[PDB]
Design a protein around this nucleic acid. Structure first.
Ligand SMILES: [K+]
Ligand SMILES: [K+]
Ligand SMILES: [Mg+2]
Ligand SMILES: [Mg+2]
Ligand SMILES: [Mg+2]
Ligand SMILES: [Mg+2]
Ligand SMILES: [Mg+2]
Ligand SMILES: [Mg+2]
Ligand SMILES: [Mg+2]
Ligand SMILES: [Mg+2]
Ligand SMILES: [Zn+2]
Lengths: 162, 222, 8, 101, 38, 82, 175, 130, 46
RNA sequence: CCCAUAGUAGGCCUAAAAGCAGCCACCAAUUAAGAAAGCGUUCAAGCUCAACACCCACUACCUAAAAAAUCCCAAACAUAUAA
């Protein structure tokens, strides 16, 4: 990985780029014929929002997702990981990948509400004052439809709307 | 070195003397006196006429049944004659002028008292029929803009097509019927009257095979 | 040390 | 070139780009020079000079920027992209311009 | 803004952006191109 | 009020001398030289219409100019309706 | 900025079309006609000359003059006073390849073709395309025997156009 | 996924190669410069000056000009061709006459060249001129 | 078949090897032989 | 993303018609760029697009909303092997 640093001495600014130790993919993949890191390790349809060890390898130090041309993912799995990272931040599973706070900012104390499987952003969601009749009920989304083909070990399929 | 490609030449195409769409009259030349029944089965089911191209290459396909009155013909005519280039394009009607009389009783009258008086005329249309056919020295992307604009204003589900897209549509539907993994189909069940299902079906369902419900056509049905 | 059907 | 032209090389006095063409790490510096040497940027401040001195000493490339205030900005482009070099270059333009006025 | 069910850009400077759960159209050049999803 | 200066009309004179070439008042008309003195490439030029695409050589710059010009014409037709 | 337009030699006018243009710039309009008329004095009056005006930040001008347009050269070389109304369907004039060669030997001295350092072949191949736009036809061999026959039949056509043209004018009055 | 089917080369490609070969073989002085974004006038005015002394200004694509060099004598000129570049070529080497025309624009760098089948840097062009 | 890259501007002058043989060969020859060579050279060069 | 010189204000019509009110042609310079696809100007200017160069934007072109009057309306749930 590359890093950039700025050192100011004598009212003169100098900018340099220095390489750093870079992690290497583990050897002997199970499926060398796979196209992206997911099928090469037989992980397709086998991860969820809570599998942070898998999700951390595809995000930046501040919680942002990495490009697809870098990771090598397929558009189908890059969208899944991009959505599972959104729900991991919201559930409090990535406390070391927080946004960068500019100098002179102290986040205010806000109601701590525990949550998981949060599809939508809290602030952009309005309350359901009218549930509606039984045949036209306004459901509450739970999870993500992108994870609907995931491996289910039960007879009841993933319910995405409560 | 961006690779350039050859282009089709339309020099071999001919343009008629009156490329624009002719005017359609509200009612036929001679007014009709004999009043007719509603005969709703003139817009029900697939069409057996004007399902193929004759002169042009682009057209508006009907995806549902309905009746066309004068107001519809004027919108199609003006919209097309305004947006098309008479020099390199031409258009023709694939539907006859309004001939089916529609009776209507006066306001405020109760049920009974005979039958109403002829109010206006319409043109029945079935699903799968071409409404307008265009052609000339033009690609499909050129006409597709205002043809879809026209198709959206029609009383039924319509869509602009070409000789290629229409063919592809039909071949893709046949492909779906062949590779369908479901062992149970509407045809097999209905024709064999399995489960006594013909007690809730219609005799037309033997031929429509579930792709039609009244005037509505369902292309996703195999 | 990974078989063809190994899943992390 | 477009993003840097809207700003303008008003505070700048001189700009110097040195690079070794045969070396395989000078694409960034040569791309930086391709924009600054545009007629859009150069026109904003004719007084502001832009110099390119080629070398073949096997040395690393650097961008030295002289300002009117007297401050200097140096960017070693061996491990920096054109966008990174341009971005940092613009931020200093805005800061030094505000200080002068 | 103007509530629209079919958003559409009216110039090159209009840009789509999803905010508060719905799509918007903003334009700094011509603020009359602004639209809200209905 | 502004008009093009009068042009002479005399077949014998027109073929003998080129009238428009000379522009100075004190100067004289330019008389046409015989065939031998003119260059060799001046009597093999394309007087007729442009050469169609099928007549040109694929391995020639004049072939791709025509093909690139036909695709510019196409991009214009498609965009006109938009 | 820069202003480029065609101005007749020795006939520069302080009024439009060129007058109002200089007004917006603020350059002296009278000075232009003074210097220009005195610089194109050697040139025959009424010849269109492409002019390129260089404007300084102090509303000071350095005029630039070019060689006459191709349309002038071609018309003169043919005798035609006015180009064709329709091209490809009627031939207004008729010139040789020798004229086209004497018109490129003087049109290649202008700023445009000279700065490109092109051969005379590239200029003659650009003048045959401008002749066609006029309707003029470029022929290899043209003797005065057939140049007086084509010139004689062209006047008949022009006479017919007058009658048809005048017929429309008379009909317009009746409307 | 199955390998993408090959495609016959375009005619223009096999035309540029024939022109490139002529450049390196016909004329002996070859100076590689960077086509900085000069105005179309300042780039036509300079090109006209370079013609007074019989110095041409050729431009070829780097994707067609790189392969021709990877398998050739001039295989060490390859790293120069990164970005907007152009060729200043002349049958006779008039380096001294080109340099003074290139000094008017301080931001136009003469990266390198190949004179008499000999590769050179910029400072070698400055000496061969002297 | 592949021309050598340019020498660094600060590196000491590394003269080409093909000429190193020519430099030595000239010393071995005798002045009278060098002189005869030279008379033909001067005329050939003109 | 990037970039734009030129025969030429093509001809005719027109008070004027300059790539863009109409009709005709739609050839040509330069490695490369429409006698001009969309704005614009009283006419011009002026801003884009298609071009070259650079090198991978290396997309989708299959669907777009919703409001009434006494008080929302079972409570709840995404992961332990089809009974
Ligand atoms: K409809
Ligand atoms: K016009
Ligand atoms: Mg060209
Ligand atoms: Mg004109
Ligand atoms: Mg015109
Ligand atoms: Mg313009
Ligand atoms: Mg206009
Ligand atoms: Mg032009
Ligand atoms: Mg046209
Ligand atoms: Mg472009
Ligand atoms: Zn806008």
């Amino acid at each position: 990985f590359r890093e950039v640093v700025e050192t100011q001495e004598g009212k003169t600014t100098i900018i340099e780029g220095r390489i750093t130790a870079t992690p290497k993919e583990s050897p002997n993949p199970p499926n060398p014929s796979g196209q992206c890191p997911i099928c090469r390790w037989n992980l397709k349809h086998k991860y969820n929002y809570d599998d942070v060890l898998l999700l951390s390898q595809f995000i930046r130090p501040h919680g942002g997702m990495l490009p697809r041309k870098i990771t090598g993912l397929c558009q189908e799995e890059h969208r899944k990981i991009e959505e599972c990272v959104k729900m991991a931040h919201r559930a409090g599973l990535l406390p070391n990948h927080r946004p960068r706070l500019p100098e002179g900012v102290v986040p205010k104390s806000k109601p701590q509400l525990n949550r998981y499987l949060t599809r939508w952003a809290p602030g952009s969601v309005k309350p359901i004052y009218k549930k509606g009749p039984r045949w036209n009920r306004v459901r509450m989304p739970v999870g993500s439809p992108l994870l609907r083909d995931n491996v289910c070990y039960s007879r009841t399929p993933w319910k995405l709307y409560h | 070195v961006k690779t350039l490609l050859p282009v089709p030449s339309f020099e071999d195409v001919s343009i008629p003397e009156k490329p624009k769409l002719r005017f359609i009259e509200r009612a036929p030349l001679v007014p009709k006196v004999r009043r007719e029944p509603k005969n709703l089965s003139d817009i029900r089911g697939p069409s057996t006429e004007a399902t193929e191209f004759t002169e042009g290459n682009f057209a508006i396909l009907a995806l549902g049944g309905g009746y066309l009155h004068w107001g519809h013909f004027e919108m199609m005519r003006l919209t097309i004659n305004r947006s098309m280039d008479p020099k390199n394009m031409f258009a023709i009607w694939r539907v006859p002028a309004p001939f089916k009389p529609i009776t209507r009783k006066s306001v405020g009258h109760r049920m009974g008292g005979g039958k109403g008086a002829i109010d206006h005329y319409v043109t029945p249309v079935k699903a799968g029929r071409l409404v307008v056919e265009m052609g000339g020295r033009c690609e499909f992307e050129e006409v597709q803009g205002f043809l879809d604009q026209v198709a959206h204003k029609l009383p039924f589900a319509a869509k602009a097509v070409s000789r290629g897209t229409l063919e592809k549509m039909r071949k893709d539907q046949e492909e779906r019927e062949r590779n369908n993994q479901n062992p149970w189909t509407f045809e097999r069940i209905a024709t064999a009257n399995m489960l006594g299902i013909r007690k809730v079906l219609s005799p037309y369902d033997l031929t429509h095979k579930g792709k039609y419900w009244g005037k509505f056509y369902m292309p996703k049905r195999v | 040390s990974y078989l063809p059907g190994y899943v992390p | 070139a477009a993003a840097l032209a809207r700003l303008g090389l008003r505070p700048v006095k001189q700009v110097r780009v040195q690079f070794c063409p045969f070396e395989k790490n000078v694409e960034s510096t040569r791309t930086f020079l391709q924009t600054v040497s545009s007629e859009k940027v150069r026109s904003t401040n004719l007084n502001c000079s832009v110099i390119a001195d080629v070398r073949h000493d096997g040395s690393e490339p650097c961008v030295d920027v002289l300002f009117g205030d007297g401050h200097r900005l140096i960017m070693r482009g061996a491990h920096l992209t054109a966008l990174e070099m341009l971005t940092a270059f613009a931020s200093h333009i805005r800061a030094r311009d505000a200080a002068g006025s | 803004f103007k509530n629209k069910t079919v958003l559409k850009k009216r110039c090159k400077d209009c840009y789509l952006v999803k905010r508060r759960g719905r799509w918007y159209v903003y334009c700094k050049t011509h603020p009359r191109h602004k639209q809200r999803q209905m | 009020a502004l008009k093009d200066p009068d042009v002479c009309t005399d077949p014998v004179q027109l073929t003998t001398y080129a009238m428009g070439v000379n522009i100075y008042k004190e100067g004289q008309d330019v008389p046409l030289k015989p065939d031998a003195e003119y260059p060799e490439w001046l009597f093999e030029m394309n007087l007729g219409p442009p050469k169609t695409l099928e007549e040109l050589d694929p391995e020639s710059r004049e072939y791709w100019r025509r093909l690139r010009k036909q695709n510019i014409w196409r991009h214009n037709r498609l965009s006109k309706n938009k | 900025g820069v202003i480029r337009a065609i101005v007749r030699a020795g006939l520069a006018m302080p009024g439009p079309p060129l007058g109002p243009v200089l007004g917006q710039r603020g350059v002296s309009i009278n000075q232009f006609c003074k210097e220009f008329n005195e610089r194109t004095k050697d040139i025959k009056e009424g010849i269109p000359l492409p002019t390129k005006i260089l404007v300084k930040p102090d509303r000071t001008f350095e005029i630039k003059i070019g060689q006459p347009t191709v349309s002038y050269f071609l018309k003169a070389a043919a005798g035609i006073e006015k180009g064709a109304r329709q091209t490809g369907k009627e031939v207004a004039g008729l010139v040789t390849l020798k004229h086209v060669y004497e018109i490129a030997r003087i049109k290649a001295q202008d700023e445009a073709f000279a700065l490109q350092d092109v051969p005379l072949s590239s200029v003659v191949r650009s003048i045959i395309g401008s002749a066609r736009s006029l309707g003029i036809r470029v022929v290899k061999d043209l003797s005065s025997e057939e140049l007086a026959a084509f010139q004689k039949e062209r006047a008949i056509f022009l006479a017919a156009q007058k009658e048809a043209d005048l017929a429309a004018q008379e009909e317009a009055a009746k409307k | 996924s199955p390998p993408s089917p090959p495609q016959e080369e375009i005619g223009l490609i096999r035309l540029l190669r024939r022109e490139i070969a002529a450049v390196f073989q016909d004329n002996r002085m070859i100076a590689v410069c960077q086509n900085v974004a000069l105005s179309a006038e300042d780039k036509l005015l300079m090109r006209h000056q370079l013609r007074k002394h019989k110095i041409l200004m050729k431009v070829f694509p780097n994707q067609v000009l790189k392969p021709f060099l990877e398998d050739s004598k001039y295989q060490n000129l390859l790293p120069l061709f990164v970005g907007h570049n152009m060729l200043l070529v002349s049958e006779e080497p008039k380096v001294k006459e080109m340099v003074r025309i290139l000094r008017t624009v301080p931001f136009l760098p003469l990266l390198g060249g190949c004179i008499d089948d000999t590769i050179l840097s910029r400072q070698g062009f400055i000496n061969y001129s002297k | 078949e592949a021309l050598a890259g340019a020498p660094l501007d600060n590196a000491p002058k590394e003269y080409p090897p093909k000429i190193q043989q020519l430099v030595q060969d000239i010393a071995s020859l005798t002045l009278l032989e060098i002189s005869d060579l030279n008379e033909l050279l001067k005329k050939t060069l003109k």
